[PDB]
Design an enzyme around this catalytic site. Structure first.
Site, PDB file in Angstrom:
ATOM      1  N   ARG A 142      60.902  89.555  63.232  1.00  0.00           N
ATOM      2  CA  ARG A 142      61.667  88.354  62.874  1.00  0.00           C
ATOM      3  C   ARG A 142      62.554  87.872  64.015  1.00  0.00           C
ATOM      4  NH1 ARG A 142      66.044  86.143  60.697  1.00  0.00           N
ATOM      5  NH2 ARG A 142      67.380  87.878  61.386  1.00  0.00           N
ATOM      6  N   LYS A 201      67.182  80.253  54.471  1.00  0.00           N
ATOM      7  CA  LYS A 201      67.031  78.990  53.763  1.00  0.00           C
ATOM      8  C   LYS A 201      68.285  78.689  52.940  1.00  0.00           C
ATOM      9  CE  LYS A 201      63.678  78.275  50.667  1.00  0.00           C
ATOM     10  NZ  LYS A 201      63.436  78.218  49.191  1.00  0.00           N
ATOM     11  N   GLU A 240      55.154  78.703  52.860  1.00  0.00           N
ATOM     12  CA  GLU A 240      55.269  78.113  51.558  1.00  0.00           C
ATOM     13  C   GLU A 240      55.766  76.714  51.765  1.00  0.00           C
ATOM     14  OE1 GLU A 240      57.635  80.361  48.907  1.00  0.00           O
ATOM     15  OE2 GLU A 240      57.286  78.949  47.223  1.00  0.00           O
TER      16      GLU A 240
END
Ligand SMILES: Nc1ncnc2c1ncn2[C@@H]1O[C@H](COP(=O)(O)OP(=O)(O)OP(=O)(O)O)[C@@H](O)[C@H]1O
Ligand SMILES: [Cl-]
Ligand SMILES: [Cl-]
Ligand SMILES: [Cl-]
Ligand SMILES: [Cl-]
Length: 539
Positions: free
Chosen positions: A257, A267, A30
Site C-alpha cells: 500500500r 475514503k 469498486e
C-alpha cells in the site's frame, strides 16, 4: 516500465516454465468513489506488467455492493486509467458474472459446502468468537436450496439471512469460520438494475471474477494477506465446475500500500473533507485524487514516474511528499516554457524612462536544449513582488532596497528613488533605470535578479497557490486530523502575467520565474479572465 521486484522475478519464472501461456492481470476497483494516487500504484503495476510481458490486463469493476456504486464512478475510473496512458485489454463488470457465481453457489450447497444462516450479525460473530457452530449449520441440502431460492425471490429483507461456507467453526484461522458467501440487499444495481437481490461477498466474488477471466497473477495490497486462505478455498472447491477451468488457476500476491505524508487516502476521511467544505469538490487540486492532480496540472507522466521511482515491494515505509513534489518539478523542467508573472503586485514608476519597448526574451535557459523566444514588453510602469522590496533588508539581501540596485529579469537594472506610503505601509515605488544586456558601468553589480511585468501590458490573473493539505506528516493516524489541515492549502492571490501567454494553447504549463510551475485551471479559466493554479512550488 516496472523496476525489478519480487513479483517481476516470479512472473518470469512462471512464463518461462509455461505454467501460464500468457500473463493476465487486472485492475479491479469498486465503482463507489474516485481514484487517488494510491490506486496509481496498482494501475501501473498491473497494466505495466501486461505490456512489459506481452500479456493482457482487464479493467474490471468489482461491483458487488449496490448501495454505494454508481456508473459515473466507473466512467471516471476508466477516464483516470486511460489518462495515465494505459490501454485496458478489456473493460468488464463483475456484476455481469453474477449468474455464474450464483450457479457456483448452488454447487457448493449441493455438495454440502455452504448453508443458509438465520442468526443476526451480533450473535453470529459471538459464536465465531467462541469457535461454536451456528445451530443452522448442518441443514439438509434440500432445506438450504429451498431457502436460498426464497432469498433470491426477495422474500426476506436486507440483512435477514446469509449463505455461509461450511469449513470449520473452531478453525485456527478465524477467516475460515464459515465466512459469509452471500448477503441480501433489496436495492438495485447501477449496472444490472433490479435483477438481483442476493449479492455476493468480496471473498467469494473476487476469486471467481479472477477465475472466470483467466487472470494468472492477482495482485492486491497487504490488507488482503489474511484473505488468502478463503480465496484459495473458493477456487479449489469450484475448479472444474460451472464452465470454469480445472487448470490453470489465478494466484494472489500482495504488495505494499502507498502511504503519502501530508496527505490522507482513506475514503472515509476524504468524504469528510468534501462534504465538510474543507475542500471544494473531488477534483479540487488540494486533493490527491487523480481527478484533482489532473486539474492541479500534474502530468500523468509525472505520476507514473513517481510510482516507478518508488518501486514495488513489501516496504510499508511512508513516502515523503518532498519526493513526489520533486518528481513533478523534475518532470516539468525540460518542457515548461518560462515566463514572468506577479502574484503580490507592487507598482513601480520609472522617472527616467518614457515610452514602451519590447525585449526579445528566451523561454528556455542555458541548461535546456530548447531555443525559443518571445516579445516581452517594458514601460515606465511595472509591478514587482511586494516580497522583493524591503526598507530594512537583511544581511544577504539580493533584491531591491533603498541603497541596493536590482536586476529586472531580461531587462534593465534599477535603483530605488522614492517610497510613497499610505496606512503605514508601502503603496508605490519611484525608481530609476541605470544596463540592458550589460553590467552597470560603475561595476557595483546588482546582487540578484527579480521578475516583473509592465503594469501597462499585463493581464490580470487569479493565482491559486496550492500548498500541501496538512502540516503534519501523519494526519492519517495522528488523531485530530482536521486540526492538522494546512491553512495555506489554498491561497488565492490576484496578480498579473506577461501578455505573451494569450498566444499559447490553454494546456500550456509554465514556469513563472522564481515562483513555481503553473497552468490554466481547466474548469474556471477563461481567456478574458485567466485563472491559474500553481502546480508545485520551486525548491
Ligand atoms: N494506496 C494504495 N496504494 C496501492 N494500491 C492501492 C491503494 N489503494 C487501493 N489500492 C488497490 O486498488 C485496488 C482497487 O481499489 P478500490 O477502491 O476498489 O479498493 P479500496 O481502496 O480498498 O477501497 C485494490 O485492490 C487495491 O489493492
Ligand atoms: Cl496450482
Ligand atoms: Cl510616457
Ligand atoms: Cl539562464
Ligand atoms: Cl537577467
Amino acid at each position: 516500465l516496472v523496476p525489478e521486484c519480487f513479483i517481476t522475478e516470479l512472473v518470469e519464472r512462471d512464463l518461462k516454465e509455461g505454467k501460464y501461456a500468457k500473463l493476465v492481470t487486472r485492475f479491479p476497483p469498486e465503482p463507489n468513489g474516485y481514484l487517488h494516487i494510491g490506486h496509481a500504484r496498482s494501475i501501473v503495476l498491473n497494466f505495466g506488467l501486461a505490456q512489459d510481458y506481452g500479456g493482457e490486463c482487464n479493467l474490471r469493476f468489482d461491483d458487488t455492493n449496490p448501495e454505494t456504486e454508481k456508473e459515473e464512478y466507473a466512467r471516471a475510473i476508466e477516464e483516470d486509467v486511460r489518462w495515465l496512458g494505459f490501454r485496458p485489454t478489456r473493460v468488464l463488470y463483475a456484476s455481469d458474472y453474477f449468474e455464474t457465481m450464483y450457479q457456483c453457489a448452488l454447487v457448493l450447497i449441493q455438495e454440502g459446502k455452504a448453508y443458509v444462516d438465520d442468526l443476526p450479525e451480533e450473535e453470529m460473530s459471538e459464536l465465531r468468537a467462541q469457535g461454536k457452530p451456528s445451530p443452522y449449520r448442518e441443514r439438509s441440502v434440500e432445506e438450504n436450496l429451498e431457502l436460498f431460492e426464497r432469498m433470491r425471490r426477495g422474500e426476506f429483507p436486507t440483512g435477514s439471512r446469509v449463505l455461509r461456507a461450511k469449513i470449520d467453526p473452531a478453525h485456527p484461522n478465524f477467516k475460515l469460520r464459515d465466512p459469509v458467501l452471500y448477503r441480501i440487499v433489496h436495492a438495485p444495481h447501477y449496472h444490472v438494475g433490479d435483477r438481483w437481490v442476493i449479492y455476493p461477498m468480496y471473498d467469494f466474488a473476487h476469486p471467481l471474477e479472477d477465475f472466470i477471466e483467466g487472470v494468472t497473477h492477482s495482485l492486491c495490497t497487504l490488507e488482503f494477506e489474511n484473505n488468502r486462505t478463503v480465496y484459495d478455498w473458493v477456487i479449489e472447491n469450484l475448479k472444474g465446475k460451472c464452465g470454469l477451468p480445472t487448470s490453470p488457476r489465478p494466484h494472489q500476491y500482495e504488495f505494499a500500500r502507498l502511504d503519502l505524508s501530508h496527505t490522507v487516502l482513506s475514503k472515509r476521511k476524504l468524504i469528510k473533507l468534501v462534504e465538510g467544505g474543507y475542500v471544494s469538490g473531488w477534483d479540487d487540486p488540494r486533493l490527491p485524487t487523480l481527478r484533482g492532480l489532473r486539474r492541479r496540472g500534474v502530468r500523468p507522466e509525472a505520476i507514473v514516474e513517481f510510482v516507478r521511482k518508488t518501486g514495488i515491494s513489501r516496504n510499508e515505509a511512508q513516502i515523503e511528499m518532498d519526493l513526489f513534489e520533486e518528481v513533478v518539478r523534475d518532470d516539468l523542467n525540460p518542457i515548461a516554457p518560462r515566463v514572468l508573472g506577479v502574484v503580490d503586485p507592487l507598482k513601480v514608476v520609472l522617472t527616467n524612462y518614457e515610452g514602451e519597448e519590447w525585449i526579445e526574451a528566451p523561454y528556455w535557459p542555458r541548461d535546456i536544449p530548447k531555443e525559443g523566444t518571445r516579445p516581452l514588453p517594458f514601460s515606465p510602469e511595472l509591478y514587482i513582488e511586494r516580497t522583493d522590496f524591503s526598507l530594512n533588508p537583511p544581511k544577504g539581501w539580493k533584491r531591491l532596497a533603498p541603497g541596493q540596485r536590482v536586476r529586472l529579469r531580461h531587462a534593465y537594472v534599477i535603483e530605488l528613488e522614492d517610497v510613497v506610503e499610505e496606512g503605514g505601509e508601502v503603496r508605490l515605488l519611484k525608481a530609476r533605470i541605470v544596463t540592458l544586456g550589460a553590467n552597470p558601468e560603475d561595476g557595483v553589480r546588482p546582487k540578484g535578479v527579480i521578475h516583473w511585468v509592465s503594469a501597462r501590458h499585463a493581464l490580470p490573473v487569479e493565482f491559486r497557490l496550492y500548498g500541501r493539505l496538512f502540516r503534519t506528516k501523519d494526519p492519517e493516524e495522528g488523531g485530530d486530523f482536521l486540526q492538522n489541515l494546512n491553512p495555506e492549502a489554498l491561497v488565492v492571490k490576484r496578480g498579473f502575467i506577461e501578455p505573451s501567454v494569450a498566444q499559447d494553447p490553454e494546456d500550456t504549463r509554465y514556469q513563472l520565474e522564481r515562483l513555481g510551475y503553473f497552468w490554466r485551471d481547466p474548469v474556471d479559466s477563461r481567456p478574458e479572465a485567466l485563472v491559474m493554479n500553481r502546480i508545485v512550488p520551486l525548491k
